Ligand SMILES: Nc1nc2c(ncn2[C@@H]2O[C@H](COP(=O)(O)OP(=O)(O)O)[C@@H](O)[C@H]2O)c(=O)[nH]1
């Protein structure tokens with residue numbers, strides 16, 4: 001009955017699509033056209049509450065989408081995703097958070113920092129690094145693998161729990 005509008009953002013290749021599809025369909029996609037942006041819905045139970053997750057997997061294509069606009073402005077929570085084997089994608093995080101702050105005109109937007117691909121040994125971004133950045137933003141940090149499903153539910157559900165904290169402060 002309660003809906004949650006989630007948006008997944010981050011540099012190309014970090015695993016935004018694989019994480020979303022893992023969440024909704026419980027499998028790991030080998031390849032997914034990096035230009036495809038679409039929303040995915042799933043009814044789930046989180047801490048005993050039935051809700052519908054309405055999740056926008058962004059792809060960053062300059063072509064107009066009225067759905068995208070709607071989601072960024074009405075998006076209640078955002079997953080900011082980098083890959084632990086992609087130093088540049090971690091450097092790109094701040095750009096994403098800053099543009100979310102602008103859309104919401106707020107420094108307190110429900111948001112979670114996600115370090116994806118944590119099954120890979122070629123790690124270049126250590127946990128303390130990402131934990132210190134999330135400390136600065138005042139948001140949770142979760143390490144995930146869309147391949148093995150580690151942390152995937154935790155990432156999306158933690159975001160819902162952040163939206164709940166926000167919603168109950170604002171009223
Ligand atoms: N090993 C590993 N590969 C991943 C993971 N998540 C995504 N990938 C792969 O990384 C590539 C890009 O993922 P994709 O979801 O298209 O990233 P996007 O551009 O952010 O949407 C694909 O080849 C996926 O199979 C992960 O957690 N572990």
Ligand SMILES: [Mg+2]
Pocket residue numbers: 016017018032033034035036057058059
């Ligand atoms: Mg994609």
